[PDB]
Motif scaffolding. Structure first.
Motif, PDB file in Angstrom:
ATOM      1  N   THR A  17       0.851  -1.186   0.000  1.00 52.32           N
ATOM      2  CA  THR A  17       0.000   0.000   0.000  1.00 52.32           C
ATOM      3  C   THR A  17       0.888   1.239   0.000  1.00 52.32           C
ATOM      4  OG1 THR A  17      -0.137   0.306   2.390  1.00 52.32           O
ATOM      5  CG2 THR A  17      -1.663  -1.291   1.412  1.00 52.32           C
ATOM      6  N   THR A  18       0.264   2.421  -0.057  1.00 50.55           N
ATOM      7  CA  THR A  18       1.033   3.660   0.013  1.00 50.55           C
ATOM      8  C   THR A  18       1.693   3.872   1.369  1.00 50.55           C
ATOM      9  OG1 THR A  18      -0.980   4.851   0.583  1.00 50.55           O
ATOM     10  CG2 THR A  18      -0.351   4.811  -1.731  1.00 50.55           C
ATOM     11  N   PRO A  25       9.753  -5.690  -2.371  1.00 46.58           N
ATOM     12  CA  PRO A  25      10.957  -6.307  -2.950  1.00 46.58           C
ATOM     13  C   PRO A  25      10.871  -6.356  -4.473  1.00 46.58           C
ATOM     14  CG  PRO A  25       9.475  -7.994  -2.129  1.00 46.58           C
ATOM     15  CD  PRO A  25       8.858  -6.679  -1.729  1.00 46.58           C
ATOM     16  N   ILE A  26      11.047  -5.188  -5.107  1.00 45.59           N
ATOM     17  CA  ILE A  26      10.776  -5.063  -6.541  1.00 45.59           C
ATOM     18  C   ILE A  26      11.737  -5.871  -7.397  1.00 45.59           C
ATOM     19  CG2 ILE A  26       9.684  -2.770  -6.352  1.00 45.59           C
ATOM     20  CD1 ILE A  26      12.377  -1.606  -7.368  1.00 45.59           C
ATOM     21  N   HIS A  27      12.875  -6.279  -6.846  1.00 44.75           N
ATOM     22  CA  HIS A  27      13.854  -7.031  -7.627  1.00 44.75           C
ATOM     23  C   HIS A  27      13.537  -8.522  -7.728  1.00 44.75           C
ATOM     24  CE1 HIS A  27      14.810  -7.509  -3.471  1.00 44.75           C
ATOM     25  NE2 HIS A  27      15.799  -8.356  -3.706  1.00 44.75           N
ATOM     26  N   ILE A  28      12.624  -9.043  -6.908  1.00 45.25           N
ATOM     27  CA  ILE A  28      12.308 -10.474  -6.967  1.00 45.25           C
ATOM     28  C   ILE A  28      10.813 -10.718  -7.181  1.00 45.25           C
ATOM     29  CG2 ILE A  28      14.327 -11.417  -5.827  1.00 45.25           C
ATOM     30  CD1 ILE A  28      12.656 -11.251  -3.114  1.00 45.25           C
ATOM     31  N   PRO A  29      10.199 -10.230  -8.271  1.00 44.43           N
ATOM     32  CA  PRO A  29       8.748 -10.410  -8.439  1.00 44.43           C
ATOM     33  C   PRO A  29       8.323 -11.809  -8.843  1.00 44.43           C
ATOM     34  CG  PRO A  29       9.657  -9.338 -10.375  1.00 44.43           C
ATOM     35  CD  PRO A  29      10.784  -9.445  -9.382  1.00 44.43           C
ATOM     36  N   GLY A  30       9.269 -12.678  -9.215  1.00 48.94           N
ATOM     37  CA  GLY A  30       8.941 -14.022  -9.650  1.00 48.94           C
ATOM     38  C   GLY A  30       8.153 -14.106 -10.934  1.00 48.94           C
ATOM     39  N   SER A  31       8.218 -13.074 -11.781  1.00 49.06           N
ATOM     40  CA  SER A  31       7.389 -12.995 -12.979  1.00 49.06           C
ATOM     41  C   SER A  31       8.019 -12.010 -13.949  1.00 49.06           C
ATOM     42  CB  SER A  31       5.961 -12.553 -12.645  1.00 49.06           C
ATOM     43  OG  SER A  31       6.007 -11.314 -11.961  1.00 49.06           O
ATOM     44  N   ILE A  32       7.567 -12.071 -15.211  1.00 47.33           N
ATOM     45  CA  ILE A  32       8.139 -11.268 -16.297  1.00 47.33           C
ATOM     46  C   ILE A  32       7.020 -10.618 -17.112  1.00 47.33           C
ATOM     47  CG2 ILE A  32      10.217 -12.751 -16.488  1.00 47.33           C
ATOM     48  CD1 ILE A  32       8.870 -13.671 -19.248  1.00 47.33           C
ATOM     49  N   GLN A  33       7.425  -9.662 -17.955  1.00 47.15           N
ATOM     50  CA  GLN A  33       6.522  -9.023 -18.896  1.00 47.15           C
ATOM     51  C   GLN A  33       6.283  -9.944 -20.094  1.00 47.15           C
ATOM     52  OE1 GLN A  33       7.355  -4.715 -19.464  1.00 47.15           O
ATOM     53  NE2 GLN A  33       8.959  -4.990 -17.898  1.00 47.15           N
ATOM     54  N   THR A 219       8.618  -0.524 -18.877  1.00 46.95           N
ATOM     55  CA  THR A 219       7.326  -1.199 -18.907  1.00 46.95           C
ATOM     56  C   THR A 219       6.784  -1.084 -20.328  1.00 46.95           C
ATOM     57  OG1 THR A 219       6.929  -0.640 -16.586  1.00 46.95           O
ATOM     58  CG2 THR A 219       5.025  -1.292 -17.928  1.00 46.95           C
ATOM     59  N   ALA A 220       6.736  -2.204 -21.062  1.00 50.78           N
ATOM     60  CA  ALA A 220       6.361  -2.121 -22.478  1.00 50.78           C
ATOM     61  C   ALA A 220       4.871  -1.854 -22.684  1.00 50.78           C
ATOM     62  CB  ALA A 220       6.770  -3.398 -23.215  1.00 50.78           C
ATOM     63  N   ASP A 221       4.009  -2.331 -21.786  1.00 51.66           N
ATOM     64  CA  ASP A 221       2.556  -2.186 -21.916  1.00 51.66           C
ATOM     65  C   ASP A 221       2.031  -2.056 -20.496  1.00 51.66           C
ATOM     66  OD1 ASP A 221      -0.226  -2.500 -22.131  1.00 51.66           O
ATOM     67  OD2 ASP A 221      -0.090  -4.082 -23.620  1.00 51.66           O
ATOM     68  N   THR A 222       1.526  -0.877 -20.143  1.00 49.58           N
ATOM     69  CA  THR A 222       1.130  -0.640 -18.759  1.00 49.58           C
ATOM     70  C   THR A 222      -0.166  -1.347 -18.368  1.00 49.58           C
ATOM     71  OG1 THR A 222       0.150   1.454 -19.488  1.00 49.58           O
ATOM     72  CG2 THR A 222       2.387   1.516 -18.550  1.00 49.58           C
ATOM     73  N   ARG A 223      -0.808  -2.086 -19.277  1.00 48.75           N
ATOM     74  CA  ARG A 223      -2.010  -2.849 -18.950  1.00 48.75           C
ATOM     75  C   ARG A 223      -1.833  -4.339 -19.220  1.00 48.75           C
ATOM     76  NH1 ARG A 223      -5.801   1.371 -18.208  1.00 48.75           N
ATOM     77  NH2 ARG A 223      -5.125   3.251 -19.337  1.00 48.75           N
ATOM     78  N   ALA A 224      -0.592  -4.804 -19.327  1.00 49.54           N
ATOM     79  CA  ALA A 224      -0.308  -6.217 -19.534  1.00 49.54           C
ATOM     80  C   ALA A 224      -0.066  -6.909 -18.199  1.00 49.54           C
ATOM     81  CB  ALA A 224       0.911  -6.393 -20.440  1.00 49.54           C
ATOM     82  N   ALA A 225      -0.655  -8.092 -18.039  1.00 54.14           N
ATOM     83  CA  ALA A 225      -0.431  -8.894 -16.842  1.00 54.14           C
ATOM     84  C   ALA A 225       0.879  -9.662 -16.952  1.00 54.14           C
ATOM     85  CB  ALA A 225      -1.579  -9.876 -16.630  1.00 54.14           C
ATOM     86  N   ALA A 250       9.112  -8.116 -14.165  1.00 54.73           N
ATOM     87  CA  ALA A 250       7.817  -7.462 -14.001  1.00 54.73           C
ATOM     88  C   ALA A 250       7.962  -6.175 -13.193  1.00 54.73           C
ATOM     89  CB  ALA A 250       6.818  -8.404 -13.326  1.00 54.73           C
ATOM     90  N   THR A 251       7.255  -5.137 -13.634  1.00 55.27           N
ATOM     91  CA  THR A 251       7.240  -3.842 -12.965  1.00 55.27           C
ATOM     92  C   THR A 251       6.364  -3.877 -11.717  1.00 55.27           C
ATOM     93  OG1 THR A 251       7.569  -2.789 -15.091  1.00 55.27           O
ATOM     94  CG2 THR A 251       6.642  -1.393 -13.315  1.00 55.27           C
ATOM     95  N   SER A 252       6.774  -3.123 -10.693  1.00 50.72           N
ATOM     96  CA  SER A 252       5.940  -2.966  -9.503  1.00 50.72           C
ATOM     97  C   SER A 252       4.512  -2.571  -9.868  1.00 50.72           C
ATOM     98  CB  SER A 252       6.509  -1.888  -8.581  1.00 50.72           C
ATOM     99  OG  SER A 252       5.532  -1.510  -7.619  1.00 50.72           O
ATOM    100  N   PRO A 253       3.501  -3.262  -9.341  1.00 44.84           N
ATOM    101  CA  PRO A 253       2.112  -2.845  -9.597  1.00 44.84           C
ATOM    102  C   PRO A 253       1.805  -1.435  -9.142  1.00 44.84           C
ATOM    103  CG  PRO A 253       2.181  -5.061  -8.649  1.00 44.84           C
ATOM    104  CD  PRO A 253       3.586  -4.523  -8.579  1.00 44.84           C
ATOM    105  N   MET A 254       2.469  -0.950  -8.087  1.00 45.76           N
ATOM    106  CA  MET A 254       2.225   0.426  -7.649  1.00 45.76           C
ATOM    107  C   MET A 254       2.617   1.409  -8.742  1.00 45.76           C
ATOM    108  SD  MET A 254       0.984   0.404  -4.518  1.00 45.76           S
ATOM    109  CE  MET A 254       1.184   2.160  -4.400  1.00 45.76           C
ATOM    110  N   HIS A 255       3.746   1.146  -9.402  1.00 43.64           N
ATOM    111  CA  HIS A 255       4.195   2.016 -10.481  1.00 43.64           C
ATOM    112  C   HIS A 255       3.336   1.843 -11.730  1.00 43.64           C
ATOM    113  CE1 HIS A 255       6.669   4.621 -12.743  1.00 43.64           C
ATOM    114  NE2 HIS A 255       7.165   3.679 -13.525  1.00 43.64           N
ATOM    115  N   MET A 256       2.902   0.611 -12.024  1.00 40.05           N
ATOM    116  CA  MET A 256       2.009   0.394 -13.163  1.00 40.05           C
ATOM    117  C   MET A 256       0.746   1.227 -13.026  1.00 40.05           C
ATOM    118  SD  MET A 256       2.598  -3.557 -14.281  1.00 40.05           S
ATOM    119  CE  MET A 256       2.010  -3.188 -15.939  1.00 40.05           C
ATOM    120  N   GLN A 257       0.185   1.278 -11.817  1.00 43.42           N
ATOM    121  CA  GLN A 257      -1.017   2.079 -11.596  1.00 43.42           C
ATOM    122  C   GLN A 257      -0.730   3.573 -11.730  1.00 43.42           C
ATOM    123  OE1 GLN A 257      -4.393   0.803 -10.748  1.00 43.42           O
ATOM    124  NE2 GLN A 257      -4.578   2.864 -11.635  1.00 43.42           N
TER     125      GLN A 257
END
Ligand SMILES: *C/C=C1/C(=C/c2[nH]c(/C=C3[NH+]=C(/C=C4\NC(=O)C(C=C)=C4C)C(C)=C\3CCC(=O)O)c(CCC(=O)O)c2C)NC(=O)[C@H]1C
Ligand SMILES: *C/C=C1/C(=C/c2[nH]c(/C=C3[NH+]=C(/C=C4\NC(=O)C(C=C)=C4C)C(C)=C\3CCC(=O)O)c(CCC(=O)O)c2C)NC(=O)[C@H]1C
Ligand SMILES: [Cl-]
Ligand SMILES: [Cl-]
Ligand SMILES: [Cl-]
Ligand SMILES: [Cl-]
Ligand code: NI
Ligand code: NI
Lengths: 322, 322
Positions: A17-18, A25-33, A219-225, A250-257
């Protein structure tokens, strides 16, 4: 001095949250774009250990015949070159790159973290190549700028001409980690951010730390899962896989929003690091999704390192003049 | 403050000896090295005005159907791009480059001097390409050097690994224009030049001036005879054609003899320019003839400009520390 990280979500960590986002831990998201695929492999044997779930799309084979196979079998002509380029103990920012001919064109980028190799695959076109002349000719514009503000202005213009991004900014950090847009190049009709100042929380401390060591992210597409890695933990260590050196991270969801709220479809930035300190960012926006080609990304990264020396000369010079 | 030039040999100038060699007009030899071909063209109409006598070999057509033809007819897809890249009044060091598919692979390099376009063609192989990663990965070695001498040593090593030249030196000018080899990387068995000092006359004043403005030059084969331009004078002006910006420019015979006396088969150097002043050279030798590919040449030129900023930071820093 960033605070310690929360566990990631897949290890039972709390929702971000804010109030707590400096601990993500933005460096270990366990996922990719999803516009590329990622594999990890043992640095000695070449055994494939983890793969993104979309790997069959890009590599034309199901994971059944991929996991546990060796890179000596999958990439027989690249495997020897890959070992020579990334020896044990090398910097995790060092990279190996090849252009594969796949039954189309795949760009392969490899780096090493500890005893693990991280392989990123993404599609590329034959006309997507960028020669060394792009950087060479751009150096002339930068060296003729008479002062620091003029240097910032010509830099944003140069980056926009090379990339075609709708907006390119030079974002300078203040001693308290607030930021100011000191230069901007933008498409006709877009409102200006020039001169605006922003709070330190928009780029939190653990992001600033990461950005001092790995100089480009996007972030190549700000609405891609995002697409998970499988298995999500590195079998070598039973611990998360460090992805700070992977552009497919994968980009932090906070930044994607944040980006979606700004109306941004694609985003990319390059660090300007001066004397080991994060001095600013070359920050780029597009109104729609956009994958900048690998050759052009590496050119932008090199331009960032050039700009850092030019800043350091000017600051040294106009500090020495006093 | 170089003395005024003699007229060139084809305008009745005197023969160059060790008594007068500071007056050799090395920038207007009226001839090129035989491993490529050169054309000049009017910058507005594209009419072909001069051509090297060997042009039919590389371009597969006799000069009869070449001279007076326009680049719009010869290079229809490159001509519009060429005009956009080199507008009137642009720097003569700015370059346009393309890779042509000729009925094999021709590399095309263009620059502008006044109202003239200078086009250099040379054969290249598909595997001769060099991506931006070459320069990117080399920047890491340079930034970790702790002082100026260490910077020089790692630079020579880096250039030798990229090129495979038998010998790479960093040659530093003293205030009186004498020089010293302050760093060297060489093939096992070759005698060392490290630490040796040389008189100012080995690189005379008009060469030092030229090398402050055009940063790369080479001799691909020290026993190859040069090929004349025809006509030898620029019809636009009735005056010699400036070739200081052309890598195919014929080398001074005085220097060719110097190289042969040293047992050198091929030579190349890159200027290190600091604060508008010639600080030193990255100087390379091969024991046999050797044409470094165009992409690798541009990478070396960019490495030279990087090294210049690193030198300027270190010198500024260890001058500011005092
Ligand atoms: C509670 C957490 C918050 C937060 C987190 C956050 N922000 C980033 C990365 C960036 N934020 C940037 C900020 C700006 N972009 C702009 O265009 C402007 C002004 C016009 C600002 C101030 C930038 C440039 C980045 C870098 C990435 C990029 O170039 O797109 C991260 C890290 C993202 C990642 O690498 O995974 C995080 C976690 N931002 C907040 O506002 C609060 C809510
Ligand atoms: C009377 C004129 C003389 C003369 C002329 C001359 N020299 C050059 C260019 C170069 N000289 C160089 C000197 C060295 N190369 C080495 O390896 C060493 C020591 C190991 C030295 C001192 C170099 C490096 C150059 C630059 C070109 C290159 O990299 O090969 C020119 C200009 C050549 C041209 O650009 O057309 C001229 C006219 N040299 C003399 O010794 C006297 C006889
Ligand atoms: Cl924070
Ligand atoms: Cl001071
Ligand atoms: Cl002289
Ligand atoms: Cl001082
Ligand atoms: Ni001083
Ligand atoms: Ni001081």
């Amino acid at each position: 001095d960033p605070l310690p990280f929360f566990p990631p979500l897949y290890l039972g960590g709390p929702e971000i949250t804010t109030e707590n986002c400096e601990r993500e831990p933005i460096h270990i998201p366990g996922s990719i774009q999803p516009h590329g695929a990622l594999l990890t492999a043992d640095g000695h044997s070449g055994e494939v250990l983890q793969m993104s779930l979309n790997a069959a799309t890009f590599l034309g084979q199901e994971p059944t015949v991929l996991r546990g196979q060796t890179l000596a079998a999958l990439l027989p002509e690249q495997w020897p070159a890959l070992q020579a380029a990334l020896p044990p103990g090398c910097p995790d920012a060092l990279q190996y790159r090849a252009t594969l001919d796949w039954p189309g064109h795949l760009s392969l980028t490899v780096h090493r973290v500890g005893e693990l190799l991280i392989l990123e695959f993404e599609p590329t076109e034959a006309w997507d190549s960028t020669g060394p002349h792009a950087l060479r000719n751009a150096m002339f514009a930068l060296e003729s700028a008479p002062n620091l503000r003029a240097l910032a202005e010509v830099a944003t213009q140069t980056v926009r001409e090379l990339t075609g991004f709708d907006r390119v900014m030079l974002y300078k950090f203040a001693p308290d980690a607030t930021g100011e847009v000191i230069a901007e190049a933008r498409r006709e009709g877009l409102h200006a951010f020039l001169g605006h100042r922003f709070p330190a929380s928009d780029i939190p401390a653990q992001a600033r730390a990461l950005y001092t060591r790995h100089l480009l992210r996007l972030t190549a597409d700000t609405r891609a899962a995002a697409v998970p890695l499988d298995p999500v933990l590195n079998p070598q260590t039973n611990a998360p896989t460090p992805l700070g050196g992977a552009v497919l991270r994968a980009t932090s969801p906070m930044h994607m929003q944040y980006l979606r709220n700004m109306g941004v479809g694609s985003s990319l930035s390059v660090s300007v690091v001066v004397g080991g300190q994060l001095w600013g960012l070359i920050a780029c926006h597009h109104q729609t999704p956009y994958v900048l080609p690998p050759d052009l990304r590496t050119t932008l990264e090199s331009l960032g390192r050039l700009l850092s020396l030019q800043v350091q000369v000017k600051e040294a010079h106009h500090h020495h003049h006093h």
